[PDB]
Amino acid sequence: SFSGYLKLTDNVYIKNADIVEEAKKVKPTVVVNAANVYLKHGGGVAGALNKATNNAMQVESDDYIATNGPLKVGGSCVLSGHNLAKHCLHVVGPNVNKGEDIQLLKSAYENFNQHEVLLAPLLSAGIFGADPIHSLRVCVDTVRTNVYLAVFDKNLYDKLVSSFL
Numbered sequence: 001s002f003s004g005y006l007k008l009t010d011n012v013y014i015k016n017a018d019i020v021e022e023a024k025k026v027k028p029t030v031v032v033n034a035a036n037v038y039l040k041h042g043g044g045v046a047g048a049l050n051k052a053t054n055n056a057m058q059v060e061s062d063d064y065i066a067t068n069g070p071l072k073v074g075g076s077c078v079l080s081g082h083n084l085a086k087h088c089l090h091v092v093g094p095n096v097n098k099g100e101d102i103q104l105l106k107s108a109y110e111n112f113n114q115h116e117v118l119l120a121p122l123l124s125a126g127i128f129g130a131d132p133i134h135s136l137r138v139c140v141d142t143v144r145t146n147v148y149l150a151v152f153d154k155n156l157y158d159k160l161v162s163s164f165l
């Protein structure tokens, strides 16, 4: 199971880790991807997870989009986890660098409540432009299921833990 996580609340745990390496090690039932509405896994967590699947995540995603159209900002879809997890829950947090409503971050985290346990990144953090401290607060106040957060950046991880209310 998950190891080396710091317990933040009854159900939220956090670790300074590369989510790709964490997924390859644990092989969780669900790994969360920081997706965009088109499931175009170019950079950030999405690009890293997709590269770990040898682009199989992108091929599967393009077929999903061709059939279903784009996701909504705040929405999600369950696809294969390939070599990383049983499933990948592609969740679209608002990208404030693309001018999207930051209030949609709570709706994005609500998708996590459909899964008993997840390995996840902080939604809308990193290249999505939101304040990661705000993302962690929305996560703890929205997610009721067991969420194991992987924060890649050590300096950000330390700031998140030291500022956690």
Ligand SMILES: O=c1[nH]cnc2ccccc12
Pocket (backbone or CB within 6 Å): 017, 018, 019, 020, 044, 045, 048, 121, 122, 126, 150, 151, 152, 153
């Ligand atoms: O951008 C990232 N690349 C690789 N691993 C991560 C783990 C957690 C959060 C962000 C990342």
